[PDB]
Design an enzyme around this catalytic site. Sequence first.
Site, PDB file in Angstrom:
ATOM      1  N   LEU A 112      91.221  22.773  24.841  1.00 44.90           N
ATOM      2  CA  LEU A 112      89.626  22.270  24.600  1.00 44.90           C
ATOM      3  C   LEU A 112      89.079  23.526  23.984  1.00 44.90           C
ATOM      4  O   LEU A 112      88.355  23.608  23.303  1.00 44.90           O
ATOM      5  CB  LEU A 112      88.951  21.953  26.135  1.00 44.90           C
ATOM      6  CG  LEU A 112      89.686  20.521  26.254  1.00 44.90           C
ATOM      7  CD1 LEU A 112      89.019  20.216  26.869  1.00 44.90           C
ATOM      8  CD2 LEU A 112      89.052  19.621  25.263  1.00 44.90           C
ATOM      9  N   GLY A 113      89.242  25.174  24.687  1.00 51.16           N
ATOM     10  CA  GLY A 113      88.730  26.066  24.515  1.00 51.16           C
ATOM     11  C   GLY A 113      89.496  27.516  25.448  1.00 51.16           C
ATOM     12  O   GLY A 113      90.209  27.370  26.267  1.00 51.16           O
ATOM     13  N   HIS A 114      89.457  28.770  25.156  1.00 50.36           N
ATOM     14  CA  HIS A 114      89.545  30.126  25.468  1.00 50.36           C
ATOM     15  C   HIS A 114      88.920  30.699  25.435  1.00 50.36           C
ATOM     16  O   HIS A 114      88.470  31.879  23.853  1.00 50.36           O
ATOM     17  CB  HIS A 114      91.525  30.135  24.825  1.00 50.36           C
ATOM     18  CG  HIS A 114      91.424  30.423  23.328  1.00 50.36           C
ATOM     19  ND1 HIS A 114      91.083  31.281  22.351  1.00 50.36           N
ATOM     20  CD2 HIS A 114      92.362  29.873  22.194  1.00 50.36           C
ATOM     21  CE1 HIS A 114      90.632  30.877  21.635  1.00 50.36           C
ATOM     22  NE2 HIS A 114      91.579  30.548  21.619  1.00 50.36           N
ATOM     23  N   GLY A 115      88.539  31.585  25.965  1.00 50.15           N
ATOM     24  CA  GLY A 115      87.981  33.218  26.141  1.00 50.15           C
ATOM     25  C   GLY A 115      88.678  33.851  26.931  1.00 50.15           C
ATOM     26  O   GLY A 115      89.614  34.069  27.510  1.00 50.15           O
ATOM     27  N   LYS A 137      90.880  23.691  33.393  1.00 48.79           N
ATOM     28  CA  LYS A 137      90.757  25.536  33.691  1.00 48.79           C
ATOM     29  C   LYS A 137      91.425  26.255  34.108  1.00 48.79           C
ATOM     30  O   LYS A 137      91.862  26.596  35.491  1.00 48.79           O
ATOM     31  CB  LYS A 137      89.130  25.578  33.684  1.00 48.79           C
ATOM     32  CG  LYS A 137      89.099  26.951  33.493  1.00 48.79           C
ATOM     33  CD  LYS A 137      87.075  27.228  33.160  1.00 48.79           C
ATOM     34  CE  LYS A 137      87.088  27.157  34.619  1.00 48.79           C
ATOM     35  NZ  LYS A 137      85.650  27.589  34.369  1.00 48.79           N
ATOM     36  N   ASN A 160      77.027  24.983  28.909  1.00 52.25           N
ATOM     37  CA  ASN A 160      77.741  24.379  29.788  1.00 52.25           C
ATOM     38  C   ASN A 160      77.103  23.396  30.144  1.00 52.25           C
ATOM     39  O   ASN A 160      77.046  22.684  31.652  1.00 52.25           O
ATOM     40  CB  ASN A 160      76.635  25.123  31.412  1.00 52.25           C
ATOM     41  CG  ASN A 160      77.472  26.662  31.057  1.00 52.25           C
ATOM     42  OD1 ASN A 160      78.729  26.982  30.305  1.00 52.25           O
ATOM     43  ND2 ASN A 160      77.204  28.107  30.974  1.00 52.25           N
ATOM     44  N   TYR A 177      87.366  33.976  30.228  1.00 54.20           N
ATOM     45  CA  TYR A 177      87.500  33.492  31.767  1.00 54.20           C
ATOM     46  C   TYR A 177      89.151  33.324  31.851  1.00 54.20           C
ATOM     47  O   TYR A 177      89.340  32.957  32.322  1.00 54.20           O
ATOM     48  CB  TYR A 177      86.409  32.156  31.745  1.00 54.20           C
ATOM     49  CG  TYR A 177      86.320  31.495  30.667  1.00 54.20           C
ATOM     50  CD1 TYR A 177      87.285  30.313  30.522  1.00 54.20           C
ATOM     51  CD2 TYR A 177      85.538  31.633  28.843  1.00 54.20           C
ATOM     52  CE1 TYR A 177      87.347  29.304  29.059  1.00 54.20           C
ATOM     53  CE2 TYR A 177      86.589  30.677  28.008  1.00 54.20           C
ATOM     54  CZ  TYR A 177      87.021  29.935  27.809  1.00 54.20           C
ATOM     55  OH  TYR A 177      86.768  28.709  27.250  1.00 54.20           O
ATOM     56  N   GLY A 207      80.603  28.822  38.280  1.00 56.06           N
ATOM     57  CA  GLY A 207      80.767  29.686  38.039  1.00 56.06           C
ATOM     58  C   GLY A 207      80.026  30.566  38.123  1.00 56.06           C
ATOM     59  O   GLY A 207      79.704  32.617  39.316  1.00 56.06           O
ATOM     60  N   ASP A 223      72.994  29.386  34.784  1.00 49.54           N
ATOM     61  CA  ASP A 223      73.827  30.101  33.694  1.00 49.54           C
ATOM     62  C   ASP A 223      73.384  28.412  32.654  1.00 49.54           C
ATOM     63  O   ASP A 223      74.461  28.018  32.617  1.00 49.54           O
ATOM     64  CB  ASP A 223      75.336  30.148  33.677  1.00 49.54           C
ATOM     65  CG  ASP A 223      76.519  31.100  32.598  1.00 49.54           C
ATOM     66  OD1 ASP A 223      75.158  31.126  31.628  1.00 49.54           O
ATOM     67  OD2 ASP A 223      76.849  30.889  32.534  1.00 49.54           O
TER      68      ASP A 223
HETATM   69  C1  LIG Z   1      84.794  27.503  20.604  1.00 51.64           C
HETATM   70  N1  LIG Z   1      85.184  27.031  21.891  1.00 51.64           N
HETATM   71  C2  LIG Z   1      86.500  26.672  21.826  1.00 51.64           C
HETATM   72  C3  LIG Z   1      83.944  26.433  22.887  1.00 51.64           C
HETATM   73  O1  LIG Z   1      83.126  26.332  21.771  1.00 51.64           O
HETATM   74  C4  LIG Z   1      84.355  25.256  23.766  1.00 51.64           C
HETATM   75  C5  LIG Z   1      84.423  26.236  25.486  1.00 51.64           C
HETATM   76  C6  LIG Z   1      84.898  25.699  25.829  1.00 51.64           C
HETATM   77  C7  LIG Z   1      85.022  24.283  25.973  1.00 51.64           C
HETATM   78  C8  LIG Z   1      85.504  23.590  27.584  1.00 51.64           C
HETATM   79  C9  LIG Z   1      85.173  23.992  29.126  1.00 51.64           C
HETATM   80  N2  LIG Z   1      85.450  23.708  29.941  1.00 51.64           N
HETATM   81  C10 LIG Z   1      85.039  22.320  30.177  1.00 51.64           C
HETATM   82  C11 LIG Z   1      85.542  21.717  30.988  1.00 51.64           C
HETATM   83  C12 LIG Z   1      85.666  22.278  32.812  1.00 51.64           C
HETATM   84  C13 LIG Z   1      87.224  22.385  32.498  1.00 51.64           C
HETATM   85  C14 LIG Z   1      87.077  23.265  34.174  1.00 51.64           C
HETATM   86  C15 LIG Z   1      85.810  23.354  34.904  1.00 51.64           C
HETATM   87  F1  LIG Z   1      86.291  23.978  36.028  1.00 51.64           F
HETATM   88  C16 LIG Z   1      84.354  23.203  34.239  1.00 51.64           C
HETATM   89  N3  LIG Z   1      83.654  23.196  34.969  1.00 51.64           N
HETATM   90  N4  LIG Z   1      82.357  22.881  34.440  1.00 51.64           N
HETATM   91  C17 LIG Z   1      82.987  22.229  32.971  1.00 51.64           C
HETATM   92  C18 LIG Z   1      84.543  22.764  33.383  1.00 51.64           C
HETATM   93  C19 LIG Z   1      85.509  19.760  30.855  1.00 51.64           C
HETATM   94  N5  LIG Z   1      85.582  18.990  32.414  1.00 51.64           N
HETATM   95  C20 LIG Z   1      85.620  19.671  29.934  1.00 51.64           C
HETATM   96  O2  LIG Z   1      84.962  18.011  29.740  1.00 51.64           O
HETATM   97  N6  LIG Z   1      85.773  20.236  28.524  1.00 51.64           N
HETATM   98  C21 LIG Z   1      85.259  21.775  28.427  1.00 51.64           C
HETATM   99  C22 LIG Z   1      85.718  22.370  27.401  1.00 51.64           C
HETATM  100  C23 LIG Z   1      84.571  23.974  25.265  1.00 51.64           C
HETATM  101  C24 LIG Z   1      83.918  24.423  24.611  1.00 51.64           C
END
Ligand code: A1EJX
Length: 272
Positions: free
Chosen positions: A32-35, A55, A154, A37, A169, A149
């Site tokens: 879903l995503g990488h940064g 995550k 978010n 974090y 966080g 945040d």
């Molecule tokens: C360019 N690019 C890669 C981006 O823009 C980008 C970056 C990150 C995400 C992302 C992040 N996180 C989640 C979480 C999630 C997981 C764990 C946690 F501890 C959380 N706390 N709050 C929520 C979450 C989900 N549950 C969920 O459904 N999709 C998510 C999507 C989406 C897009």
Amino acid sequence: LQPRRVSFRSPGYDPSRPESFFQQSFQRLSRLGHGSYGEVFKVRSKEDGRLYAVKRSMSPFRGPKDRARKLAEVGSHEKVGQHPCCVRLEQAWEEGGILYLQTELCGPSLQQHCEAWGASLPEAQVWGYLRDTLLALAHLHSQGLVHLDVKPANIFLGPRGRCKLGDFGLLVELGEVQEGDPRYMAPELLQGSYGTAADVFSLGLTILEVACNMELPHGGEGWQQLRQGYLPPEFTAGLSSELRSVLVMMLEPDPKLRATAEALLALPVLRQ
Ligand SMILES: CN(C)C(=O)c1ccc(-c2cnc3c(-c4ccc(F)c5[nH]ncc45)c(N)c(=O)[nH]c3c2)cc1
């Protein structure tokens, strides 16, 4: 090396195999995503076969403070507890210095949604997202919790046009604070005044961004404009009088006079 559960209060896993508990109890579906974090994966559990989002932190724990800082997000999820407009935490564990959080699977972030539409959002969606995130903030603020945040990245979409507040966080409990995003920063945060009012300002800028398709300034001249109590004249024109009225209430520079999330949700325009 064994996975240790993380809380402030595994059938597919064979503790004898070398693969991590993450790789043995889950089926990775997509990243879903990488940064900095770490990474967020869409996973299906090899135990129950439901969809979750996991995550994982990027690097092993650098030290005690780094560990405590990372595990605090788990404590923050627990203080928030169960609410329909909050991303629920299912479980968290640590293995090999890496922290793993497993939440319910949501839709795209509000940021991804707006990016996909590439235009302003229609006001009908905006009011719904405003009401859902206001419900989340009211639930947080009633327990003396400040998110710190609130921003499109978010907030995560739910079915049938709902959305849920996430990424705890940076959450703090009034009674210790990290650098928030300056684009969404409330003005009083600059002079050390932390409180639930700050979340209301961040939501107003969040709504101003998605309803006007305008990018927020990181600093400088434009940053000051959004914090004098007048909405920007160019972008505000499309909005309705009620929306413009509520944004002015949320974007009041003085936290002592800024409407609270409970006060907002009690207005006529923000009805069920
Ligand atoms: C360019 N690019 C890669 C981006 O823009 C980008 C970056 C990150 C995400 C992302 C992040 N996180 C989640 C979480 C999630 C997981 C764990 C946690 F501890 C959380 N706390 N709050 C929520 C979450 C989900 N549950 C969920 O459904 N999709 C998510 C999507 C989406 C897009």
